[PDB]
Amino acid sequence: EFQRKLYKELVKNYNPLERPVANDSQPLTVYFSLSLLQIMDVDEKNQVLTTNIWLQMSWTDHYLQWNVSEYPGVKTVRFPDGQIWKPDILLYNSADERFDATFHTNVLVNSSGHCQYLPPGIFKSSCYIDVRWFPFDVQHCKLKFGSWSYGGWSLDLQMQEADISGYIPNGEWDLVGIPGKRSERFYECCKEPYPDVTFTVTMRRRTLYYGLNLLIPCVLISALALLVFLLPADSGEKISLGITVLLSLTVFMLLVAEIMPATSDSVPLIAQYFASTMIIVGLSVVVTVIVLQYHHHDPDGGKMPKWTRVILLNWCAWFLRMKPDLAKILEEVRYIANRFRCQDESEAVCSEWKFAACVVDRLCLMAFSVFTIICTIGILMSAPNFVEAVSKDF
Amino acid sequence: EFQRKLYKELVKNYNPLERPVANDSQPLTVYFSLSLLQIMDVDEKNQVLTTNIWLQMSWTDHYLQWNVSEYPGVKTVRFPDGQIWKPDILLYNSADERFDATFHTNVLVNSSGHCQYLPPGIFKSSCYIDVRWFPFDVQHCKLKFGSWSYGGWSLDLQMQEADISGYIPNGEWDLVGIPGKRSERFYECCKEPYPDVTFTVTMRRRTLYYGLNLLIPCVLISALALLVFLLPADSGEKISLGITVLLSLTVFMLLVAEIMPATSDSVPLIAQYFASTMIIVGLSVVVTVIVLQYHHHDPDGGKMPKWTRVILLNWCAWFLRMKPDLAKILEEVRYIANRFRCQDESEAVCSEWKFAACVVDRLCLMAFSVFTIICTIGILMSAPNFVEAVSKDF
Amino acid sequence: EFQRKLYKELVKNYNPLERPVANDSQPLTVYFSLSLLQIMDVDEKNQVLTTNIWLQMSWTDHYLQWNVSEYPGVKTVRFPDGQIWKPDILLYNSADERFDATFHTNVLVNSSGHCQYLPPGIFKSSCYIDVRWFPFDVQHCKLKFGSWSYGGWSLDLQMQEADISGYIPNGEWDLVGIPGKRSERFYECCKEPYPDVTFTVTMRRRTLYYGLNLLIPCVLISALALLVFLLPADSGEKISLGITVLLSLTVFMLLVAEIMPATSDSVPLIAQYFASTMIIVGLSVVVTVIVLQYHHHDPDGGKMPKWTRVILLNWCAWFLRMKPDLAKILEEVRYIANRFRCQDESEAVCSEWKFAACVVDRLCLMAFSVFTIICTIGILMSAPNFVEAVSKDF
Amino acid sequence: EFQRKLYKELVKNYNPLERPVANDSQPLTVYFSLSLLQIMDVDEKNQVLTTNIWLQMSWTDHYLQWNVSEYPGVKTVRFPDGQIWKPDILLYNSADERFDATFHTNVLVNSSGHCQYLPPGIFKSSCYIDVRWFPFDVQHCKLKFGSWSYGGWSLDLQMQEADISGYIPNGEWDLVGIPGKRSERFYECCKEPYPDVTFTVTMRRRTLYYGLNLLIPCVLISALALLVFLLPADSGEKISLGITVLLSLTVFMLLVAEIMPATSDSVPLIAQYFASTMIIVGLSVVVTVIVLQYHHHDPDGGKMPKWTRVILLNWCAWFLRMKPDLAKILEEVRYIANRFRCQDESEAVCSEWKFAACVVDRLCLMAFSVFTIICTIGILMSAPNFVEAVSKDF
Amino acid sequence: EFQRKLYKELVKNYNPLERPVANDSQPLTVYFSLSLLQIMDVDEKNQVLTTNIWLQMSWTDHYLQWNVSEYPGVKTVRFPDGQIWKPDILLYNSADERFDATFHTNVLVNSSGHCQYLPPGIFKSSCYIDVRWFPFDVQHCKLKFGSWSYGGWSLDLQMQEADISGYIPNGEWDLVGIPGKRSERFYECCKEPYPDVTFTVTMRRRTLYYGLNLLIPCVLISALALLVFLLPADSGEKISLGITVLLSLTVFMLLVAEIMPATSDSVPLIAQYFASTMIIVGLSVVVTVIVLQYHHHDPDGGKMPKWTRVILLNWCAWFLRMKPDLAKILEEVRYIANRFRCQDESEAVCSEWKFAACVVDRLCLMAFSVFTIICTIGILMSAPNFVEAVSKDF
Numbered sequence A, B, C, D, E: 001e002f003q004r005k006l007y008k009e010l011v012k013n014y015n016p017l018e019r020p021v022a023n024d025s026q027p028l029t030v031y032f033s034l035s036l037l038q039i040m041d042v043d044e045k046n047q048v049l050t051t052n053i054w055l056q057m058s059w060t061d062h063y064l065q066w067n068v069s070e071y072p073g074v075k076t077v078r079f080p081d082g083q084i085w086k087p088d089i090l091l092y093n094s095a096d097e098r099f100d101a102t103f104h105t106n107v108l109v110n111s112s113g114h115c116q117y118l119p120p121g122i123f124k125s126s127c128y129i130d131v132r133w134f135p136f137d138v139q140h141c142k143l144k145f146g147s148w149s150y151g152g153w154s155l156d157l158q159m160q161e162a163d164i165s166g167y168i169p170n171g172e173w174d175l176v177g178i179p180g181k182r183s184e185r186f187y188e189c190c191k192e193p194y195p196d197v198t199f200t201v202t203m204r205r206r207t208l209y210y211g212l213n214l215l216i217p218c219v220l221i222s223a224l225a226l227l228v229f230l231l232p233a234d235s236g237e238k239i240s241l242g243i244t245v246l247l248s249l250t251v252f253m254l255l256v257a258e259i260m261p262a263t264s265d266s267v268p269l270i271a272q273y274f275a276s277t278m279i280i281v282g283l284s285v286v287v288t289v290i291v292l293q294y295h296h297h298d299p300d301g302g303k304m305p306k307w308t309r310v311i312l313l314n315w316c317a318w319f320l321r322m323k324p325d326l327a328k329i330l331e332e333v334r335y336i337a338n339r340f341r342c343q344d345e346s347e348a349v350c351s352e353w354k355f356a357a358c359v360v361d362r363l364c365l366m367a368f369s370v371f372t373i374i375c376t377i378g379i380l381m382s383a384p385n386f387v388e389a390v391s392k393d394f
């Protein structure tokens, strides 16, 4: 009975186009806040952040006021979209096809005219995502809210601290914070401020998943490529081992491609690491070909250069701590024996070439081991957030 | 004739903004229940549960009452969306872009004013999905429903047991249950309860599919990696076998990647199993390289260390139960015979090195077999739901 | 002039909320039929059938009647959505986010009040898809239609045979039929029937595509795995051939994964066939390792067991139809000759071990050939729809 | 001033439900045409054509006429959707979830009452796509337009030639033409025609992309499989080469799968070509195994059959244009010499078996080369649109 | 109070169908501009450009004017969609399913009647994307805006320079510019211009990403294919190396396929480069087979042709700077010695054939190296935007 009377009375002559101030010259203060419930996606290709957010607006409607003594029991009223004035606060940097992502809920008012509007939404905002340090990258995404058409002398936008009590932690992104700031922009024409409220979402990429799917597989496959330098040449499998390791890295690249960013503004950190690892596997195959050249050197070819015999068989090999009828029968038998002696000399020459091959495998083992470790440590620790990341995620 | 008169009479002065109670001070009891028809998806990346659900609301409208004697034949009426008051019960933790997923069906009322509202919908709710024990994981997803704007003294929300008679069993998830609970939240300002109804969907992952696509392939490929230790070195195919098995696991990883979860909150169980299996295949290739080093050992190199000949050729080899002119012609022929004797001594030394290689293959066969079995059994049975899962799904 | 007058007259006092019967106690008969134009998708993961369907409803509106003599030329009228009463027939088991998939076309009425409503739509219905016999599976998907709120004493739903004259044959599914049935459900409270009309779409999976992309490739790759038993051991390529065939099957699995169903309610038929084929390829690699063990057996090792020489060299090998100074020079020359004789004896022993290896390759060739044929024939012909399928599709 | 007066005057008593004819017995002629701007997609799995099309409708509204002398300056008026009568022409075979894909633009009318309606849209129509001759296939997709509810005596649909001046050429489909035809369907009840306008889009698949991604790669990989017959057996790499070529074709199949059609109504042309090529690569591996059997034939095994020595070493090999103390020392030395002579005889036998292997490689080289060329030429030129396609696209 | 009075006064007798000019014969000038915020996607398959754009329209409404002295404090008013007249400017070449992508914001008017309309939107326009020079391609995409129904004598469209102050740089596309142009089209019927405003977006593809994912991997894998010519034939791994490199390129093609364009209007630049590289790897395998033919040439076969011994062993080999009882014992021993001499002659012949094989590997090394460099440099530098691209992106 009383709310029937009240609802009839409140909408008599009410115009939802009218900003509800007693004095049209005075501004209408609107309190704007938000509540972040979820980070949904960070699209680095489309440069868009998707978030679950409940916006919180509050103001005072001069017309929706009543004496609670004349309508006992009726402390609040609800108005659906389009029936009363609402602040036209929109996300300026919206990247949604609808532009307005909010679900228009009812406006709750109490007897004194204080209106509360709690529109939920799944927002999509344009955010520049810098993947230079991927996967140890920290992103700062702005959410800029403001009145589409009212200036600061008509709509006095005020900010309140964002609520994160209901935030559901993301599995891929760590929320550093959601700080907010009120700013005013001025047009050179006029002296009216134009206010906006910007919330800067700072979020850190969790790196455990990437540690086990990109960093480790690349270290361990790189190690198996170094194993070629320990395989004896007589096996006849050095090329098989090395070339098949390279193939495994190509097949690996397929898995890596689904999670690596596709940009041309910079070479990500992990792209420098993956490329580095594959040049070292490629160069190990190249060094293996040279080693086989030495091992299979034809004994009747070119005599071991003097420099080859010094730089390898002496210096490097030390540093590495390696180390009538009767007369006719005589002629026939002297030929057989001399043939065998020539074979022995040829085999001795081949043994020197084979030992040189061994020495080059140990030099390359040592050099490639050092070079892989230096690149791995240097590339990963060049990230400013490496230490913090590993400490928090591992 | 009579329903024409009745429909005209029921909407005279009716305001769909008005909560329909005779006393505005008294609360309006709303009975809320749901009916779960289908679990559609459990998105562990976006942390969203999609379900097919028919909500069931009931209340009493003080204004929609008529004497069935004055309108014979007219026992019920139907009102479409927006024509009469409805409870504003919404899914609080909705993750839908529309926020409100319900299809607004007609409200059925009978002569005494009892209204039944059966809105169907495909709901998307935010649910934290813990994949620590994947694929033997049990998930608990909450569905929290409540009035958007009414407090407990105006809208007295009451719960009824969820209906699962129409539930269609899912092929991927086993429905443990859908228990419900009514709760009240209080603001420190005031003494009015704010009620909500939460339905907790508990669902168990069926593991048969994962048993045949991840667990078994990994066991059987791991077994083929152990086969390198049985392959004789003279084949010249040990590295080929072992390295190609590793490649097959990389290609396998591709299939596994489509179904494995991508999170950084924990290493899933199956990720520990897959990683474990691949370190053992990688280490078998490493051990094979060492074995080939022994088998192709140069006979004129370093004499078998004393420790090598004891730790291997004696202890391990026992535990494994293995085991003028005439004088000139004399000189020419004595050289030929002595050359052959030197060859025999060299070949005998090589045979010892080759037998040592055999012994290391049996040690590694035994050790790697034990270590694969222990890791497989230990990793899979570390799941609290392993026994139950295997009993129900296999 | 006349239709202007008529349209004005027909909507005077008309209420689209009113069921249009002269007697509110009498039921309003609605004739319901459908027309199936296309099967669009059979989602076995989401358990949803998508179909192109034109629904056909007919009833009689007591109020939309006119004398065609008083409005010459005006034989029919059209009313858009919301202007006149319509039956609230909905798909009960709808799996669409909109729930109502129909496009609301105009209601055509003639002078006697007979209304025809032909709403088109792309419907999504929840259908349990049993993939036990994939790809020789027949599916039965129900389409249950009924009034959302009217009981059988108010809305007398009647069925007519579904129209399939306009059906466009699907490339993946063969339409067996679309039989319909009217049923009544009773509540224990009351004696009013609640009718519904269910159309059961029976559709058979066409198997030609699967015959050329899964069945054949698996037979032919399985055959190439058997070819290892024909490759002589001296090639040094048995392991290479066998292990690379297994890899090709893993790469094949990738193609197969895109079209195989992902369920845990049963192991599909094709999953049993693919698994079977890969265990036999895996076991051929295992048998090859054993064969190489025999072929490279060290001649100075363990004497061929007595049982080995009988079970293989005799029985299986028969069944398979296989089969001063002068004296010093004497000593030097007698050693050379005796060394050669020892070599010949050692080589003879090795030849027996090599022939045993040959015999095991023929046994395994024969056994594996038989076992592959039996599994292929047995697994595929275990499908109840195998004969029919092959006869209609090949 | 004048258009204000005119707009007020034109909608006085206007009913948008009324077909706007002075005589309700006379039909209202509607001129229907379309303008094709783009072919967007040809979905052969879902059997749907997506096109960008601007429909063009024209008619005469008897009520929207005014004297341009009484409203100077007002030559035309615009009416938005729902304000005036429009023809209910819809795409009959629409495959869109909205069914009606048009964007409802304003209706332009001039002083004489001639209305022009230019609704744009992205249309989805159901088209049977026959991929028997893929990628040399020509498709004919119908677009059938008609009034949903009006018969030919009320709405006289007339056709005009489709406009293709604004057509943007597609990169995948060549537009042969868009011919249109007006037809009338009769119901046996009645003598009123029911007209429709059907536009048949004929489009030819461009084949350049498929020439470089499917046809060529398959020819060149097939050639590399033939290279096994030129590789000498002593390399020990024939199986490696052949088996790795087969693997490369499996990996190739992956790329081919993304662009090949998935149907069971026929085996496409390119599926016959790809299958053919892979049976020939598979059979080359089989023939290689036989060749190795000959090359490694044990010299102490079965004597070259008489037929083998004739069919190969003579006929095929011609067609291919190939081609006390002292006495003791005598005994010791006579054994050494006789041992060597036996070795020479054994080696001579082996040389015959090795030459037979060479002859079989040349026969197979020649035969497989011929058979690959015949299948390639025969399969591709069996397409009725092959010559035209290659001439226009290459 | 004053804005309530004003809003009531402004909509008295206002018709949003009326073009708001004091003189219906005079045109209404509309100022049209846009603001480009983001390039979202360049779909070269669907030929569609997606952009984030805020349109800017301005005009003068003759009816929305008021004296600011009679309504103090009320300087501006806002009107939502449908309440006042708006220009019907649409994107002519829209490729959106909605056709109209704008979000209809409020129209801001001031006391003098100047209306500002700032509709945001995510636009999809049809743009022909020429990928002939991919990835060094520059695209020109037009955005054509105009009134749907008004001619130039009723709606005088005027252009203003596009605003790019808020443009967010894209990671894949470099914005060269957004120049605009006003044009008039005439119908031969009449002398009224029909104006439109076209904005031509010129954008350059950034090539850093493609440099590291397509250009480099193809160079480095091509280099590893050249390494076969340095591998000695005795290794028995030349075919293994070469054939596995080809496989790695096939697996590589998979990654390349996701980013390469699929068109039949031309062969892109990168498709010519990738094809070129793979023909050279294929031909290296072919040349390797020929080399092995020489190396394993049977010594008792065909004598080195005279031309072979000149073209290779002399010219090319120079250019490349390469280079009673007693008598019985005599007979037995003379046979042994002569057997060895025959072996030496046979081995000498084989050495010539093996040296010829070496010479062919160096010729092919040199020739293939030159041919790879020429094709790489020639194909990439044939792009008109190569120099500029590399200078700006690397």
Ligand SMILES: NS(=O)(=O)c1ccc2c(c1)[C@H]1C=CC[C@H]1[C@@H](c1ccc(Br)cc1)N2
Binding pocket: A212, A213, A216, A217, A218, A220, A221, A224, B253, B260, B270, B271, B272, B274, B275, B276, B278, B279, B282, B283
């Ligand atoms: N996606 S996953 O389940 O996290 C997954 C699956 C397999 C796998 C890993 C992760 C990595 C984590 C540890 C081993 C490492 C990788 C690997 C690479 C080379 C060698 Br040698 C051995 C092992 N194996």
